[PDB]
Write a protein that binds this DNA or RNA. Sequence first.
RNA 1: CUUCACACAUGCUACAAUGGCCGGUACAAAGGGCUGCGAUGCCGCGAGGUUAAGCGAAUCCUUAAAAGCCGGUCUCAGUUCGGAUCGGGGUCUGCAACUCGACCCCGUGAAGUCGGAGUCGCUAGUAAUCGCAGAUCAGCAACGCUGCGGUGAAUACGUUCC
Lengths: 155, 62, 57, 83, 116
Amino acid sequence: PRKGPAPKRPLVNDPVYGSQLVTQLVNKVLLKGKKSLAERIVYGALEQARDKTGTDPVITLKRALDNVKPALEVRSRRVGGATYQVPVEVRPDRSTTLALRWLVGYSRQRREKTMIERLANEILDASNGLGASVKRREDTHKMAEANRAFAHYRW
Amino acid sequence: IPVGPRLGNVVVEVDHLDKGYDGRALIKDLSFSLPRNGIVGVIGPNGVGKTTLFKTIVGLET
Amino acid sequence: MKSDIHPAYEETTVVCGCGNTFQTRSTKPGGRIVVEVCSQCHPFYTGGRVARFEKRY
Amino acid sequence: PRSLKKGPFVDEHLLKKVDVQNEKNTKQVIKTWSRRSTIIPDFIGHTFAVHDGRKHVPVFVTESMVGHKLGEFAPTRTFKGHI
Amino acid sequence: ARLVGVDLPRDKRMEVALTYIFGIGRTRSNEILAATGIDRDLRTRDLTEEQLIHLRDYIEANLKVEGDLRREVQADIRRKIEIGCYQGLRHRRGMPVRGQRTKTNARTRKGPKRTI
RNA sequence: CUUCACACAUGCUACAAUGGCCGGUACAAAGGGCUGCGAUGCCGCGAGGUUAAGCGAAUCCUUAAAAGCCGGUCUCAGUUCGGAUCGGGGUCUGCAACUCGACCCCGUGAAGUCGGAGUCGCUAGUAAUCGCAGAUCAGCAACGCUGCGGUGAAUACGUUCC
Ligand SMILES: Nc1ncnc2c1ncn2[C@@H]1O[C@H](COP(=O)(O)OP(=O)(O)O)[C@@H](O)[C@H]1O
Ligand SMILES: [Mg+2]
Ligand SMILES: [Mg+2]
Ligand SMILES: [Mg+2]
Ligand SMILES: [Mg+2]
Ligand SMILES: [Mg+2]
Ligand SMILES: [Mg+2]
Ligand SMILES: [Mg+2]
Ligand SMILES: [Mg+2]
Ligand SMILES: [Mg+2]
Ligand SMILES: [Mg+2]
Ligand SMILES: [Zn+2]
């Protein structure tokens, strides 16, 4: 932090679907170190993402991510007696991270029975611009467009 | 509006419903789960079957 | 008023699991009232504390 | 005596006090300090005076105290209320 | 169905349905459903009528179920209160009878907080 | 020293489906053992009981690791979640378990549906979770403390603010 920028860990491709996004997706479903249960859910939510679309599930996921990747998020700061949020431009590698927890994070609190389809019913709707994960990327934008006046506080 | 008892994780759920009348079939292939702590709006032009959808839910029309 | 406001009431043969049956009149539709216990599968015909240590306690 | 193998343990110095009086139909009072002892039905007929720390609280083993210890009849902590 | 005045529910297996009797848990239920042949997958909406009759005399010849089993419990409390044992001077006051810590915890025999 | 009209503090188990209960089946490490450890066989639903093989131990015993993996089942309910309280019957150590022990079995089936203002820990084999062993010790309030491994994350723009 305060000295320099910290080094970054690499990633290994998933054997079932060769893609960096897939192991990065299994890694954030993971609670409690139970890793193979987290790959028994992401595989079961991509394989069920072709039973009712028929297309390739990686291509479904590269576009449901592209409907939840933000590019302009907002970031609080205090000046005097009023504290007011300043919009900042988002670097690309942070964008894929906020997008991907917006998939898993809303999928826990849907209304189905098991996590195998709750992640599937959110990858489905975000590929068409429907779900609650897509609701936030515009509220992240609309909160940060309704404050464009404070755009000269880049710290 | 008075406050009622505690609402569970299910409210009401409708899966692949079909209902109309004789030749005039007004509901085909509808599936939804009705949410918890929200306000649900039914939008549709007249003569489409918005009142009859609540006949099935209340249970006066199978 | 002893006309067509009272419920339907015709004779009704009733059986139990004990096998003792009888024939009375009641409002069950079909003569089909079925019990699992009766008044002749039972008597009305003929019928800690100091017992603690007797298992050498 | 908690286990049924070794039988119901009751201290010896009170067993001799009840056997000397039960044979000739004599029901005195007995001063004792053996809270650990269990009720045998051998001394249904007469009373006791069990210790608590102040003074020997009297107890009359009537018919259904048996099985329980003597010391369940002396509460040893007073507590008659915070107010 | 109706085993002994107890109103067995519907659409629930017999492995769990007999547990609703006051006196049958998960272990005595497994030996009611072995001595009378009834398997551990039989739903309650398709019970045979005489198959319940086998089910209601193995219980009423060996076990003790309610009506008098509630009378077993509260009369055994009723004896301890009147003999004057300390454990019956403990049911008089709503305090734990098994030497539990009464300083910080023990809300269950007492009730929730009142902050006087 | 353990008492309770109540307040604080450190923990543990939880409120479930990334789960509960059943049947299969794998991969550890570091440790203790002659006042002992108890293989194996027989009996007991179970804690245990009883015989006695081997061993001052890289021998032999402690030992069978638990999560995990493959199948079934419950289908979102204060429940097949939860295991508190209380009845009943036992086992073990010990002169003795009543105030005041741990474990087992049977029935019961409490409060709780992710917690107000505030606040805490963690930058990598780390947090999170999963058991195993030791020191005290006759037995234990062993969920505590000291240790060991199994599985194994996310993020760090930056020094404006505390
Ligand atoms: N009792 C009935 N029998 C047959 N058809 C009916 C009956 N009541 C309503 N409908 C049909 O229902 C359709 C619309 O339902 P309706 O309740 O009128 O919807 P909305 O309330 O949205 O106007 C109409 O086509 C009408 O013909
Ligand atoms: Mg209408
Ligand atoms: Mg102390
Ligand atoms: Mg729930
Ligand atoms: Mg349970
Ligand atoms: Mg298992
Ligand atoms: Mg055996
Ligand atoms: Mg499974
Ligand atoms: Mg409640
Ligand atoms: Mg550091
Ligand atoms: Mg010890
Ligand atoms: Zn009869």
